[PDB]
Amino acid sequence: DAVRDPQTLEILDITPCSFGGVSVITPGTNTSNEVAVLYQDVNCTEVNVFQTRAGCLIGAEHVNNSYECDIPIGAGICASYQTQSIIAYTMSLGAENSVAYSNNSIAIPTNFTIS
Amino acid sequence: NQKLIANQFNSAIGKIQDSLSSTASALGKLQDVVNQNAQALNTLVKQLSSNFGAISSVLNDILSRLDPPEAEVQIDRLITGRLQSLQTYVTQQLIRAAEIRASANLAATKMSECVLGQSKRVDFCGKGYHLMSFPQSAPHGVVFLHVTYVPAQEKNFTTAPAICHDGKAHFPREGVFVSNGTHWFVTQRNFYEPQIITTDNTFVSGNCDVVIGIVNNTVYDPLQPELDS
Amino acid sequence: VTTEILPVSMTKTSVDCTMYICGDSTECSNLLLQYGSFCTQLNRALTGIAVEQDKNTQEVFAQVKQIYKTPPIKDFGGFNFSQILPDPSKSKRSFIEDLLFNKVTFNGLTVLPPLLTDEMIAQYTSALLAGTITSGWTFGAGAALQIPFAMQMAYRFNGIGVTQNVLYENQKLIANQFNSAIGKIQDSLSSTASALGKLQDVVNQNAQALNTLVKQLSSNFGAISSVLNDILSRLDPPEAEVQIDRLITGRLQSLQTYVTQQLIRAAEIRASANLAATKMSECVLGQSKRVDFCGKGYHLMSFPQSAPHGVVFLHV
Amino acid sequence: FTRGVYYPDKVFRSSVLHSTQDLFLPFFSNVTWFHNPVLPFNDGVYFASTEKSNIIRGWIFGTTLDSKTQSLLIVNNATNVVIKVCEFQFCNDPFLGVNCTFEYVSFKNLREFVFKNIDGYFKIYSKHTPINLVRDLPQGFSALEPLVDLPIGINITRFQTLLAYYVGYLQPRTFLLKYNENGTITDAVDCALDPLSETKCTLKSFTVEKGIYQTSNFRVQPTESI
Ligand SMILES: *[C@@H]1O[C@H](CO)[C@@H](O[C@@H]2O[C@H](CO)[C@@H](O)[C@H](O)[C@H]2NC(C)=O)[C@H](O)[C@H]1NC(C)=O
Ligand SMILES: *[C@@H]1O[C@H](CO)[C@@H](O[C@@H]2O[C@H](CO)[C@@H](O)[C@H](O)[C@H]2NC(C)=O)[C@H](O)[C@H]1NC(C)=O
Ligand SMILES: *[C@@H]1O[C@H](CO)[C@@H](O[C@@H]2O[C@H](CO)[C@@H](O)[C@H](O)[C@H]2NC(C)=O)[C@H](O)[C@H]1NC(C)=O
Ligand SMILES: *[C@@H]1O[C@H](CO)[C@@H](O[C@@H]2O[C@H](CO)[C@@H](O)[C@H](O)[C@H]2NC(C)=O)[C@H](O)[C@H]1NC(C)=O
Ligand SMILES: *[C@@H]1O[C@H](CO)[C@@H](O[C@@H]2O[C@H](CO)[C@@H](O)[C@H](O)[C@H]2NC(C)=O)[C@H](O)[C@H]1NC(C)=O
Ligand SMILES: *[C@@H]1O[C@H](CO)[C@@H](O)[C@H](O)[C@H]1NC(C)=O
Ligand SMILES: *[C@@H]1O[C@H](CO)[C@@H](O)[C@H](O)[C@H]1NC(C)=O
Ligand SMILES: *[C@@H]1O[C@H](CO)[C@@H](O)[C@H](O)[C@H]1NC(C)=O
Ligand SMILES: *[C@@H]1O[C@H](CO)[C@@H](O)[C@H](O)[C@H]1NC(C)=O
Ligand SMILES: *[C@@H]1O[C@H](CO)[C@@H](O)[C@H](O)[C@H]1NC(C)=O
Ligand SMILES: *[C@@H]1O[C@H](CO)[C@@H](O)[C@H](O)[C@H]1NC(C)=O
Ligand SMILES: *[C@@H]1O[C@H](CO)[C@@H](O)[C@H](O)[C@H]1NC(C)=O
Ligand SMILES: *[C@@H]1O[C@H](CO)[C@@H](O)[C@H](O)[C@H]1NC(C)=O
Ligand SMILES: *[C@@H]1O[C@H](CO)[C@@H](O)[C@H](O)[C@H]1NC(C)=O
């Protein structure tokens, strides 16, 4: 955990060197040979760079627009290939649709389909 | 709507054929079972080529090259590695089998409740109101075609929990009161089909001073015109 | 109102089998490779579980294709849902959800984040709750069709064999009993930490599994030393390899034990996730007629709440 | 480019992707381009040459290459290939105009060779093909079959070429080799070239489906020693 320096009477902590798994985000080689690389659970200072909770993501462009998830990274972030480059975005959970609720109104279907 | 319903059904089946023909991944669940089992055996066989600390992965080379007092030691290393490999494989097969057993139990449950009957369980037999289902065979599994009723075009109606007639509070026996802006009707809950509100559609309980949101209306009595005529 | 708690997911622990056994050691790694796929398939087994854990969360919570929202005016016929609806002034979670969260707590071992973060689960439970309150079961089966809340309850009462006139005549009483019952849930969860013991237990079992795995590194397994660097510093290869081989067998065996336990435990959690998904589909989106499926009594409705590593249902 | 691949063994494989580690020329690495210097042998040599008039005749492999110890002399003189491992005395600058333990006697073109010396055996692989290119090596892929296997028992650290040609060096890298129905290698992946190649080797497929895959482990390396 820590050692005493034999020449100087001081105590030094030993912190093992940063490491983590490396994952490659691939759009699929049928469309593109471009990939983005995720260094899991590390800071980008040790490794078009985006720092996320899941690690340091390199090569993917961060986009402010939300999209449905395609290739998941983690912690709310997914990757995709769009018009072309690899991008990262916060995933959308679904379409927003407020309900027109009131105390005197009911919606009743007038037609149906069989699926 | 029998002609409409039959046509929608027939169209939907044609869509299933196109979906299955177009995308193989539709059956990814069955392909995945096949892939995992195949991988488990490829892994098991590949392990025969490992030394596991032995001088050689080949049993015959150990036996013909080393004198028995030493060959036995090298063999014990191969036996431990190969025996351990089988134990790993078997444990994985048993755990994987538990997953498949659970799936099979679910599949059996669905066939009994979804195919042989008419389930009332929501999203048990797909999204929508379950009508019926049909089983199909498949490699190492079962495929169900779930036929469901899904509400489609809809309208915004004004409503009320009850109506006031002679001060009596009338409630629908099996429906909801609606208004198109000028007239009140009673309609079945899942399909707009307005009917004249009559004593044969509603029942009386309590009065207008109790029900919150009760509105004024006229309830038709089919008997009075007959008594008068 | 009763509370039922079901675990949905495990901590996504991922283990680097090479670093675990042969941390920063070339000589050890060369020997480890003699075991073929014994190391690699363990990394694979754990990866498969981590993926499964995200699958479990999605099957339970992502049952709605749209994010529904309640109106600014809570005109729900006297029924007070503000204790289960998200608080916009804060993490967009309800009072009860905050109570639920506050009651549950370098060896090649890392933990991956879930795909859906706590605020995203909160959005899903918010959508399901908004759907349940403003459109009953139709947001489940088809489109979310607005219905007055008191009227929705009328349907729920007929669904258990009680003529809806009972609801309207006693609407004030029913709303008051409901509001009181939710308040009781807040007090029960605030006071009794053990209320969420099922979620805490999953966390504790996984913590023990990892603590055991790490402690095994201190074992000699017949070697002169549990420390790989000491063997390498003291002995020349002709013998060092023997001492290392003893550690590799013991440490590889330790991982196999760990992974097997994680896979069996994962099967248990998966079963719970499947049950949770089933209850949400049949209990929240619909109206179950299955006895004691949605607590004691005749089922009228239920509301999902998010929780650490799982889901909590309030059954009415 | 993608050349410097040879059949690692004498085993027939078909319709299969085989992962192996051996000394291969790393893909897209630099090779020294020559138009008679003494070069290092290192762990093995990738040699390639182009011809119009059969200028390159042979090679010398050894240590001192000065009648002090044993060395390999491989020369194709007019019509007959001669291989000798004698303790030869060589010229200050050997060229061709217009104690022995082993002896054997047998731009428009490209001749590729791989020379490696492992455990006393000198392995020679080669490939011949027509070309139409003056400036550089052609881009494309082929694998070199073994031709000669000499039980020399001789240490090689340096070599020289006897008279354009290219010299590269082999490294212990993993490759994924694609075998066709006829037992030949039609493609290859250098598993340490880039992150996509790493993915292909991990999945053991020349094409990969969309998704995220774990392929390796990042480790910060020590820079000093205390
Ligand atoms: C319910 O919707 C269906 C369409 O999904 C209607 O059927 C269509 O009617 C149009 C004419 O308006 C025709 O051109 C289409 O060919 C019909 N389609 C099919 C499949 O029959 C149907 O009439 C609607 N029903 C009600 C009661 O409004
Ligand atoms: C509500 O429905 C009633 C019944 O269909 C509508 O009243 C009828 O309107 C038609 C003209 O479109 C007349 O020919 C009928 O004689 C009316 N019936 C009665 C009983 O008055 C009424 O117009 C609809 N209201 C709205 C706002 O759409
Ligand atoms: C339904 O109709 C009745 C009359 O038939 C309404 O009763 C009136 O209530 C107001 C308010 O208390 C009194 O000032 C009137 O004198 C009452 N009328 C009669 C004839 O007694 C009742 O308010 C109506 N309700 C709704 C919801 O419209
Ligand atoms: C729902 O119940 C909550 C209590 O849990 C009500 O919030 C309180 O409102 C009163 C004013 O009427 C304030 O004085 C309290 O300080 C509030 N308490 C908290 C904890 O915020 C809420 O108003 C009720 N809503 C409805 C629609 O009945
Ligand atoms: C049904 O039981 C409820 C209590 O659970 C009764 O409501 C209470 O009535 C007393 C008077 O006797 C009041 O002091 C309480 O404040 C009421 N409680 C609530 C929540 O409203 C109700 O009256 C009973 N109904 C019948 C028909 O007996
Ligand atoms: C995807 O693969 C098919 C062959 O199965 C090919 O025809 C198609 O062009 C490929 N897609 C792209 C974008 O190149
Ligand atoms: C990552 O490094 C930056 C410096 O560039 C530092 O500000 C930040 O706090 C670090 N984060 C972690 C989690 O170490
Ligand atoms: C997102 O918007 C913020 C401003 O709120 C801006 O600073 C940031 O650079 C934007 N990011 C991208 C990827 O557009
Ligand atoms: C009902 O009214 C709302 C507005 O409150 C509107 O957005 C919705 O489309 C209407 N529905 C129908 C079927 O007209
Ligand atoms: C419905 O809401 C309106 C607007 O707040 C209110 O005036 C009316 O009395 C309410 N009716 C019922 C039955 O709740
Ligand atoms: C090649 O050189 C050898 C001597 O090493 C000689 O015996 C042979 O005849 C020569 N061949 C030709 C074709 O010149
Ligand atoms: C051959 O080797 C012997 C030593 O065994 C040495 O005495 C002799 O001089 C060598 N001959 C030549 C031609 O180098
Ligand atoms: C090659 O070098 C080794 C020392 O690393 C030596 O023992 C061996 O005898 C040498 N081989 C020859 C043929 O001189
Ligand atoms: C194998 O060789 C035959 C000629 O004997 C050729 O026709 C065939 O196309 C070759 N197959 C492949 C896969 O190259």
Swiss-Prot record, chain A:
Q: What is the effect of changing T83A?
A: Partial loss of O-glycosylation by host GALNT1
Task: Quote the annotated effect of T110I.
Answer: In strain: Alpha/B.1.1.7
- What is known to happen upon mutating S80A? No effect on O-glycosylation by host GALNT1
Q: Which cysteines are joined by disulfide bonds?
A: C44-C56, C69-C78
Q: How is it used?
A: Main component of the anti-COVID vaccine Chadox1/AZD1222/AstraZeneca; in which the human tPA leader sequence is added in N-terminus to enhance protein secretion.
Compartment annotation: Virion membrane; Host endoplasmic reticulum-Golgi intermediate compartment membrane; Host cell membrane
What domain of life does the UniProt record list for this protein's source? Answer: Viruses
Q: Name the reported effect of D41G.
A: Increase of pseudotyped VSV particle production ex vivo. Increase of viral load in hamster upper respiratory tract
Write out the PTM section of this UniProt entry: The cytoplasmic Cys-rich domain is palmitoylated. Palmitoylated spike proteins drive the formation of localized ordered cholesterol and sphingo-lipid-rich lipid nanodomains in the early Golgi, where viral budding occurs.
The entry's stated outcome for H62Y is:
In strain: Gamma/P.1, 19B/501T, 19B/501Y, Omicron/BA.1, Omicron/BA.2, Omicron/BA.2.12.1, Omicron/BA.2.75, Omicron/BA.4, Omicron/BA.5, Omicron/BQ.1.1, Omicron/XBB.1.5, Omicron/EG.5.1
The record lists glycosylation at: N30, N43, N64, T83, N103, N111
Q: Which family does it belong to?
A: Belongs to the betacoronaviruses spike protein family.
Q: What else is known?
A: Variant D614G has become the most prevalent circulating sequence in the global pandemic since April 2020. The mutation is associated with higher viral loads produced in cell culture and animal models. It would not change pathogenicity nor neutralization properties vs vaccination. May be prevalent because the mutation increases virus transmission in human population.
Q: What is known of its domains?
A: Contains sequence and structural motifs very similar to those of a bacterial superantigen and can directly bind and activate T-cell receptors. Activation of a broad T-cell repertoire may be involved in the hyperinflammatory syndrome in acute COVID disease. The KxHxx motif seems to function as an ER retrieval and binds COPI in vitro.
| Protein name in the entry | Spike glycoprotein
What is the originating organism of this protein? Severe acute respiratory syndrome coronavirus 2 (2019-nCoV)
Write the span of the intact protein that is present: 574 to 721 of 1273
